[model samples]
Target: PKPIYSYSILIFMALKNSKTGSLPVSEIYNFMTEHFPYFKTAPDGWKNSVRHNLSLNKCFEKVEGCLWALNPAKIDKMQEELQKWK
Candidate 1:
């Protein structure tokens, strides 16, 4: 089965896996859809959740314009949470 990940983790994976450690919201959506079939087929509501997480989660920081990246200070904590999920 495909991995069931929360929006925050999904965002983290998308940013971390990128060539640069940041991406626009569109790129983030594309990353999720391309990597996880669940997002490809899931309802549109998931997109809203992704946006919500990005905006509300302190670990995510808006780098510039529409680009979003993980805050360096929060990487360890996010990784710790990610590890717990695994």
Candidate 2:
């Protein structure tokens, strides 16, 4: 029972790299911890108080939208934010 993924859908987590493509939630967490990622390292809004994804452990959730990956738009948006930090 795989969840649906569309190019337009938003990703709650960032893949190991955009090149890795949109990985499932299970893989998303693995990709993050595997890489020892940080939300600050994500595109942006990773610390959105509303999204609450600022926490590192949410990657394990099974909810559809509760994932750590986001679509390209979100990826771009987050990247924009992280860039400002630099």
Candidate 3:
């Protein structure tokens, strides 16, 4: 599967932006669309792709319900890896 690098970063940032370092998938999606121009008019599969990435990537972990949070150890590494590609 193709990587949505920026999408992952934004998800991390959105969660970090919260007082709590976690959020539901819908809230994360809303934050992306509201705050980032690229997500304002996301293409059809974009939502699924983001969701998929969150599930597949080790850096993101589900807390409960539909809520997700960053894995502190993996998140730092994920950011470093993304930074290299950025």
Candidate 4:
């Protein structure tokens, strides 16, 4: 079995005039943490990856980067979201 390797942590933030205005830094950071595999942390490279894939100009109307991007959040939130289906 492969041994588990500890993750290298990093910080993500918008540079000046980076067109990062669409997302609050905290939300973007949280979004990246939830969206990608092996992306349990919001490292700089991971942030850049998110910038490319999740930016509003690029990602279309999907609300591309979010905690609920893959699956819903807490059950109540999920229930609220699913009420549209009911």
12-73: candidate 4 lDDT, tens digit per residue? 12211124423444565554354433556334574564445433322212334232122122
Pairwise TM-score winner, candidates 2 and 4: 2
Per-residue lDDT of candidate 2, residues 1-86 (tens digit): 21232112223334525464445555544544444445325555422432344233333233343434434444566555445543
TM-score: the better of candidates 3 and 4? 3
Model 1, 1-86: lDDT tens digits are: 44667889989989888777789999988988888877777767888888999999998988843899888899899898889887
Error of 1 at 39 (Å): 1.1
Each model's TM-score, in the order given?
0.88, 0.36, 0.77, 0.27
Q: lDDT rank, highest first?
A: 1, 3, 2, 4
Best by TM-score: 1
Clashes of 2: 11
The whole-model C-alpha lDDT of candidate 3 against the native structure comes to: 0.77
Q: Give every collision pair in model 3.
A: none
- Give all candidates' CA lDDT scores: 0.86, 0.39, 0.77, 0.34
Q: Which of candidates 1 and 2 is the stronger one according to lDDT?
A: 1
Instruction: Quote the positional error of residue 69 for candidate 4 in Å.
Output: 13
Better of 2 and 4 by lDDT: 2
Candidate 3 residues 1-86, lDDT tens each?
A: 23355667777777878777888989988888877767676568888877988988787899853888888888677768667766
